[PDB]
Structure 1
Amino acid sequence: LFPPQWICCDIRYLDVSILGKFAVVMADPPWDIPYGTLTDDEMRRLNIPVLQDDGFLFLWVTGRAMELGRECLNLWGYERVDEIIWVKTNQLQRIIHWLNHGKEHCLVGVKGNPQGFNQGLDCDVIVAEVRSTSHKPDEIYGMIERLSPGTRKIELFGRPHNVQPNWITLGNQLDGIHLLDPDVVARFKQRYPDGIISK
């Protein structure tokens, strides 16, 4: 079901087996490098492996999560095959411990053998304006849509502004539960007949 869907939840505790398989997973984790951060062990233990059979994973990383996210990627069953760089600019196209940081990193992992994707349409550099401290650039969704048009996608740790068509968004600051895909609704009602996600 094309239009945006979301689930307000603790991603540690949601049973993601109810969501189906997705051509693309994106995650912007609250790495422990505060608000609602996950320990390294909690990140490792996330049940990413059930989310895909054949597809790509986009994993935002900074600091030592550049290494930790590579570990998670491989533990979850992915090979890192690309790395997107977002060059941070102001509205005038100028760049915003040992070095000042002008960019943010997003690892790209592959699982299985994805077929019918448009690899090589975009290049691995994004140039875009900073907004709120916590706001990834919306160009990533266009690159992902062109890479895999029409397919189902899931975002982990997104925020309300991140809900997009063809995407199910998960995060603990979303407003309730909004599900439209009939297969997801059925499996959700079975798993959570009183609409609560604990333990």
Structure 2
Amino acid sequence: LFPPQWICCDIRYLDVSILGKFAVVMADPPWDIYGTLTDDEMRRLNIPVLQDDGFLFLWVTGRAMELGRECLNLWGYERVDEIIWVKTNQLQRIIGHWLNHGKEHCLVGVKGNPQGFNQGLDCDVIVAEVRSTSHKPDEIYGMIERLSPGTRKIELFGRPHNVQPNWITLGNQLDGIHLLDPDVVARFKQRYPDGII
């Protein structure tokens, strides 16, 4: 079901096995560098059930630059790329205690044998204006769409602005449960007959 879908929930306790497999997973987790997850909770997240072949996009900062690599590898991925977003203002000028930070990082992991992807279409630098606090740039969805067009995708720890066609968004600040894919709707009713998690 192409139009946006989402599930308000605590990603720790939701049974993600009901959602099927995704060509792309993206996550912007609350690392314990305000709703944080501990390193063990992050390690235990059931990312491995979500894909057999495809890509993982994992936003990282501070010590999660290292801890995100750990989770990525533990979850069964190999880091094959790292996107950086150069944060600019409206005049295309650039906006960790040793250096000032002009950028945010997003690791790119591959799992299995993905085929039918358009590798090489985008480059690994994003230049885009800062919207809000902790808001990631919308350009990442265009890059992800060109890499794997039309496929089903899932975002963990998304916010309401992050919902997108072809994406299912999980996050604890979304407004309720909105699901349209019939295979998912079935497995959700079966696993959650009273609609609570």
| TM-score, normalised relative to structure 2 | 0.99
In the aligned structure 1, how far is the partner of 2:49 from the partner of 2:12? 14
- 1:118-162 superposed Cα distances (whole Å, 9 cap, x missing partner): 000000000000111110000000000000000000000000000
- 1:92-123 superposed Cα distances (whole Å, 9 cap, x missing partner): 00000000000000000000010000000000
In the aligned structure 1, how far is the partner of 2:171 from the partner of 2:131? 20
In the aligned structure 2, how far is the partner of 1:45 from the partner of 1:146? 31
Counterpart secondary structure, 2:186: helix
In the aligned structure 1, how far is the partner of 2:76 from the partner of 2:184? 24
Task: Please state how far the C-alpha of 1:166 moved relative to its aligned partner.
Answer: 0.2
Counterpart secondary structure, 2:18: helix
Alignment match, 1:29? 29
In the aligned structure 2, how far is the partner of 1:142 from the partner of 1:86? 14
- 1:25-52 superposed Cα distances (whole Å, 9 cap, x missing partner): 000000000x211000000000000000
Residues 108-147 of structure 1: pairs in structure 2 closer than 5 A: 108-147=108-147
Counterpart secondary structure, 1:195: coil
Counterpart secondary structure, 2:52: coil
| TM-score, normalised relative to structure 1 | 0.98
In the aligned structure 1, how far is the partner of 2:176 from the partner of 2:108? 30
The unaligned stretches of length 5 or more in structure 2 are: none
Task: Please state how far the C-alpha of 1:187 moved relative to its aligned partner.
Answer: 0.1
Counterpart secondary structure, 2:35: coil
In the aligned structure 2, how far is the partner of 1:133 from the partner of 1:193? 37
Give RMSD over aligned pairs.
Answer: 0.3
Residues 47-126 of structure 1: pairs in structure 2 closer than 5 A: 47-96=46-95, 97-126=97-126
Counterpart secondary structure, 2:66: helix
Counterpart secondary structure, 2:110: strand
Counterpart secondary structure, 1:154: strand
- 1:6-43 superposed Cα distances (whole Å, 9 cap, x missing partner): 0000000000000000000000000000x211000000
In the aligned structure 1, how far is the partner of 2:150 from the partner of 2:132? 29
In the aligned structure 2, how far is the partner of 1:22 from the partner of 1:130? 28
Percentage of matched positions with identical amino acids: 100
- 1:162-193 superposed Cα distances (whole Å, 9 cap, x missing partner): 00000000000000000000000000000000
